[PDB]
């Protein structure tokens with residue numbers, strides 16, 4: 001039987017929050033079967049839980065956030081969420097003593113190492129996958145995202161960049177998901193932003209944790225970071241990282257074919273909710289036989 005996974009041990013790390021510019025302490029904790037992914041703010045007292053749920057997502061100006069019944073938020077969850085998906089973590093409690101997850105280097109890679117530190121513990125309970133049964137498509141102008149039936153997990157992402165620093169040769173990325181493929185091809189791709197916009201935000205007391213150490217920054221013409229890009233197509237790779245984090249907001253790995261054009265957080269979430277809302281368009285599947293498990297979802 002393919003089993004659910006959690007952490008072996010409690011681990012913690014520290015890093016600046018993109019919004020506040022303050023030091024945030026991140027604590028990752030093991031959790032029992034079926035409890036899922038729970039984000040928790042411990043700056044608030046009493047602390048507040050935010051179960052990762054498609055319906056609870058909001059696409060904020062910076063990154064994304066989860067909200068509770070009272071519109072209290074926890075922000076910047078998507079990069080860590082992508083790492084959870086990558087390593088197949090099903091149940092976990094994620095605590096921060098702040099309103100946001102630390103931005104780290106702008107990618108998911110630092111969370112990969114943190115999760116490795118915590119170890120993977122298999123629980124005696126079947127891991128549930130969301131298998132796509134019908135083609136489901138959502139749109140927003142010329143933008144669209146869709147899921148199609150497919151025995152595995154593929155992502156086909158096209159971005160509609162018009163910036164001098166992004167060549168047409170790097171407008172699209174497509175991959176067969178797997179823990180190894182996520183870790184090596186995707187996890188190190190950093191988020192990015194436009195310097196003038198960031199300047200404005202900081203002039204308004206926002207995005208205070210922003211720095212060259214946590215993002216690719218371009219002006220009108222070029223990448224400003226001294227060392228340049230980690231990949232020639234780092235921008236689109238990060239947008240796929242973001243797609244993986246968005247889709248994992250349901251707390252389950254998906255068996256299907258993901259394809260999107262000019263998609264973002266809002267549209268990715270719109271697709272996720274559209275699929276889950278349509279009873280006929282999907283079903284939970286488990287694998288009592290480990291052999292039946294598709295290639296993409298094998299352990300690292």
Ligand SMILES: C[C@@H](O)[C@H](NC(=O)c1ccc(C#CC#Cc2ccc(N)cc2)cc1)C(=O)NO
Nearest residue numbers: 061062063078191192193198210211212215242
């Ligand atoms: C790409 C988007 O989808 C989205 N990214 C963000 O919204 C985002 C917003 C701002 C920054 C930044 C910065 C900075 C700085 C800086 C550099 C140098 C100096 N001297 C001073 C400040 C980075 C990402 C995302 O990835 N969601 O998952």
Ligand SMILES: [Zn+2]
Nearest residue numbers: 079191238242
């Ligand atoms: Zn991102």
